[PDB]
Amino acid sequence: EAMEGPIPASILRNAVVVATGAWVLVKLTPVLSLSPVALTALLVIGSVTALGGTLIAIAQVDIKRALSYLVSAYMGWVFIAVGLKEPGLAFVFILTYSLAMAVLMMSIGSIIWNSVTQDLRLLGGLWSRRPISGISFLVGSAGLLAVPPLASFFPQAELLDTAFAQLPWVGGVLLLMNTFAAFSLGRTFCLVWGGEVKPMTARSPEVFWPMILPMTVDLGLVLHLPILMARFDWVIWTQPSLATAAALTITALLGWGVAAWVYLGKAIPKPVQFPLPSVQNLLAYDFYTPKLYRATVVGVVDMIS
Amino acid sequence: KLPPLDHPLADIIYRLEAGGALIPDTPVNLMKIIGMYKAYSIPMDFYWRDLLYLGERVFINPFPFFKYFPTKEYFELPNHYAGDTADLRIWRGPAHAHPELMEFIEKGETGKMPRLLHHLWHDRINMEFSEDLARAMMWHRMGGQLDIYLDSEEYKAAADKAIRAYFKRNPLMLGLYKLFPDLFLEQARQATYMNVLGLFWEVMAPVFFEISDRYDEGSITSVKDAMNFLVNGIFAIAGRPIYHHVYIDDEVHVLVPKEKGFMWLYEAAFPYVEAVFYRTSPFRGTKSYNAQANQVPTDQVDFHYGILFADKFPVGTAGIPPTLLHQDMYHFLPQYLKDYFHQHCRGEDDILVQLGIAFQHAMYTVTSAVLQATRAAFYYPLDDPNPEHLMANRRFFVAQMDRFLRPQYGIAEACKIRNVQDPNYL
Amino acid sequence: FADTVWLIPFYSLAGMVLSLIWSPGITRKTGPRPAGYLNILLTFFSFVHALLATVAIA
Amino acid sequence: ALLALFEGGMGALVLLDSLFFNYVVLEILTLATYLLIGLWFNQPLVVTGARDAFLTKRVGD
Amino acid sequence: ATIVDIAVNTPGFSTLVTAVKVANLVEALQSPGPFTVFAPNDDAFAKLPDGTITSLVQNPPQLGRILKYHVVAGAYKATDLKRMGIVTSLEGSTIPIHGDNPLEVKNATVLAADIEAENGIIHVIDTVILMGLDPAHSFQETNIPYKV
Ligand SMILES: CCCCCCCCCCCCCCCC(=O)OC[C@H](CO[C@@H]1O[C@H](CS(=O)(=O)O)[C@@H](O)[C@H](O)[C@H]1O)OC(=O)CCCCCCCCCCCCCCC
Ligand SMILES: CC1=C(/C=C/C(C)=C/C=C/C(C)=C/C=C/C=C(C)/C=C/C=C(C)/C=C/C2=C(C)CCCC2(C)C)C(C)(C)CCC1
Ligand SMILES: [Zn+2]
């Protein structure tokens, strides 16, 4: 519900959510290390919110709410990392994730500003007539999951090696979190920039100079991050072990590819229905979290009041 | 001449059938109307010049940093009809600019400063509201019959030639146009819609100039006479052409030709009344674009966010576009309206809110003039003896009032009419 | 620099008091733009300061 | 002004390394989030989103 | 020529012929094809603010578009038009022709229908004409049916 008011959303989901609680949680690593129960609870919360955020972001129709659940998921990733007594990985990943999500939110805001709807079901062919806002989204996508060239790969590589050295099942989430989160962005690109053009976006002029300057200037930072960690030897993942470096990329590319096939394939009805209809409208309403709140806490605190 | 039928809005139809006046016809109701026309005409007189500047000289500028500084000669650009070398000669006054607008450009609200410094310190004419309208006519497709022409095989070729001639200096842009030829081709279409809207306000600015002078002399005595002057001016200019004519270095590129047969009524007046008076893509600080909360419609036919449906008490607050015009339409106020507002609710403090309510009143008579012109063009006059020829007019008015009642998304719980008929709405 | 980097949270805290000079009930004339402009100025000056402080603590 | 009160709060949060003053600003930013989401309060789904965004984020803090 | 000279010689039609001469419909409207056409007859032009005609005459193409809308390809008579009810003109059209004793074109009434000519039937009406709106792009509710 904090997706009311665009571009604090480009800064809140990107500069507040990333370094407000995660910053407090990381600098508390010495204290949280004292009890090996807070750490396992930390792993549980992070993994649960990661899986839930990815699965819910896949089942959204509002472009502005199909990225905030991904914010929840990639902050759960930081919860996981800090759960493995790895504060350095969290401090490194915050930077890359923040850059990428800034590009993503600015591109989505640019699309919204001129294409009034936010319904994914009402936006269509924009690639041919709107390149920058599309390539920026694509680069912000690649700089979040995979493409070892782009910089978010490095910090999510050590957290595979570390989660495999100890407590392997956690890695099984981190790997899986890399395909669902890739299927969401995929269906958010293949719905806003690919496909047949629709009434609401029949005449989409590209935006003016002040909305695509930061977006393109922030699209450069993401492309230089990988090379900015080469000039100055800031090695993040010491042992290469390409056996695991070839896993994240395969997972992400597979997710994004299935996403592109389902939506750019015209081999399926476009308002896609799930074989189980009851779970589609359950991920779409975030597990009915409001009906949960108004039942457990509010309903109590109100009643006794 | 006909029986009373059923409507809850019937009290208004009996007024439309018998003369006009979509709003009541009291003298205090017309003083504010003419004052609002006089106040809305001078920023409009800058708008129609700056939009032409955008459509011809800033055709597709990646960095149109200035973009609101028309050249010295676009304030000398002869308004096609206000003076001696006029085309239909309404508004007797000078045909180059307005002394009041030139004064505001010169001194602003602080003092005689360079124009760039008048822009940084806001002190401006809030030109962003005219661009928002131009971008609101597009994306609704409501351009008229040239939108279907604005597609291919005559426009894409002319736009290609114009673009290749515009960027010929820097090969960076030229190369970009080669990769994505539809990137600057959709920005060309935008300049075309800017030109269309700027050509619509080259007609309404003289009309709103001359109506205030008619009221000053005393020829305007009731709202009926005001809307009748509006209808006569509408029919008088219904044939003027529409074109683009992008000017590049020592060259003009005929983008949409005069020989295509696009006229002012069917390509800039009717597609404008529906776009800005009716549709006007939803306010950002009044409705939630949230796709799950079915609040904003899915089809563009049910966009009830125009000036006729607007909510003018939250004016001057965050997330509400029309404020940009009411601050723009505030310092060009005649004295008999400043005195009328200063003795009222909150005095000269909330002057923007009542100044916007009066603007709503004025635009109601403008759209009523559009309704009367529409029926006089496509239907039968009021002085018709036949009964079927009078039932046709009644059906048309009932249809056009049903647009004010459709309860799809509170479209009936918006629609400021039956609220403008109230004397205590101001 | 790098010895006065603790002044960074004040630059913006100086823009959060000055930008309110332009709220619609205070100016009532020519309002809405230099607030954002001066906030951008303050943010740029606080970014330059931070970049210099980072270079100085290599 | 609210965007400037985040840029200041963010700096004060990353500079100060006391668990106590890392909560002071952490709550000031909760208040700032309440007023920032509720920017255009004439929308009935913002005054409901800003309510949750302040209460949910306040209980944790 | 044929339709032109017929409009010139016997009846008044003193402002239609000049309107056509201003446009380039003199070469057309006489080439061999029926294209039945009706005329406002100097009084439909009278029930119009004169600024209308003074602005249309200065712009040949727009007046030409209107006059093309007056022209309807094909050869039809009052019975044919009553049977059809809707007929396409040049530049496309709807032209909801109606009426029972006098054939009522969109919002006019015929005066002298079935005026034979060399290459086309000619009708005479009392309101001028104006094109539809295509509610997908222009103003919305202006296609109210005339008869029930
Ligand atoms: C080692 C093997 C690697 C394989 C890895 C597999 C990873 C798959 C990615 C994860 C799938 C996510 C499941 C959750 C979906 C969900 O809960 O909601 C379903 C959402 C609902 O969106 C709905 O959208 C609807 C409109 S629209 O469709 O979005 O336009 C709207 O009505 C509705 O409200 C909205 O919620 O829609 C979907 O995304 C459905 C996705 C399921 C499609 C999978 C089919 C498999 C195809 C076979 C592969 C083809 C071969 C190609 C080879 C390259
Ligand atoms: C407006 C627009 C456009 C265009 C735009 C553009 C073209 C932009 C560009 C942009 C750009 C072009 C950007 C760039 C950027 C870059 C960057 C941002 C960089 C950075 C770098 C860095 C940061 C580096 C670093 C380093 C090095 C390398 C050296 C030393 C240091 C180290 C690291 C440390 C057009 C026409 C389409 C139209 C529409 C829109
Ligand atoms: Zn400016």
Automatic annotation (TrEMBL), chain A:
<feature type="transmembrane region" description="Helical">
    <location>
        <begin position="207"/>
        <end position="230"/>
    </location>
</feature>
<feature type="transmembrane region" description="Helical">
    <location>
        <begin position="90"/>
        <end position="113"/>
    </location>
</feature>
<feature type="domain" description="NADH:quinone oxidoreductase/Mrp antiporter transmembrane">
    <location>
        <begin position="1"/>
        <end position="176"/>
    </location>
</feature>
<feature type="transmembrane region" description="Helical">
    <location>
        <begin position="6"/>
        <end position="26"/>
    </location>
</feature>
<comment type="function">
    <text>NDH-1 shuttles electrons from NAD(P)H, via FMN and iron-sulfur (Fe-S) centers, to quinones in the respiratory chain. The immediate electron acceptor for the enzyme in this species is believed to be plastoquinone. Couples the redox reaction to proton translocation (for every two electrons transferred, four hydrogen ions are translocated across the cytoplasmic membrane), and thus conserves the redox energy in a proton gradient.</text>
</comment>
<feature type="binding site">
    <location>
        <position position="224"/>
    </location>
    <ligand>
        <name>chlorophyll a</name>
    </ligand>
</feature>
<feature type="transmembrane region" description="Helical">
    <location>
        <begin position="66"/>
        <end position="84"/>
    </location>
</feature>
<feature type="transmembrane region" description="Helical">
    <location>
        <begin position="166"/>
        <end position="186"/>
    </location>
</feature>
<feature type="transmembrane region" description="Helical">
    <location>
        <begin position="38"/>
        <end position="59"/>
    </location>
</feature>
<protein>
    <submittedName>
        <fullName>NADH dehydrogenase subunit 5</fullName>
    </submittedName>
</protein>
<feature type="transmembrane region" description="Helical">
    <location>
        <begin position="242"/>
        <end position="264"/>
    </location>
</feature>
<feature type="transmembrane region" description="Helical">
    <location>
        <begin position="134"/>
        <end position="154"/>
    </location>
</feature>
TrEMBL record, chain B:
<protein>
    <submittedName>
        <fullName>Tlr0906 protein</fullName>
    </submittedName>
</protein>
<dbReference type="InterPro" id="IPR010220">
    <property type="entry name" value="CO2_hydration"/>
</dbReference>
<dbReference type="Pfam" id="PF10216">
    <property type="entry name" value="ChpXY"/>
</dbReference>
UniProtKB/TrEMBL annotation, chain E:
<dbReference type="Pfam" id="PF02469">
    <property type="entry name" value="Fasciclin"/>
</dbReference>
<dbReference type="InterPro" id="IPR036378">
    <property type="entry name" value="FAS1_dom_sf"/>
</dbReference>
<dbReference type="InterPro" id="IPR000782">
    <property type="entry name" value="FAS1_domain"/>
</dbReference>
<feature type="domain" description="FAS1">
    <location>
        <begin position="1"/>
        <end position="129"/>
    </location>
</feature>
<protein>
    <submittedName>
        <fullName>Tll0220 protein</fullName>
    </submittedName>
</protein>
<dbReference type="InterPro" id="IPR050904">
    <property type="entry name" value="Adhesion/Biosynth-related"/>
</dbReference>
<dbReference type="GO" id="GO:0005615">
    <property type="term" value="C:extracellular space"/>
</dbReference>
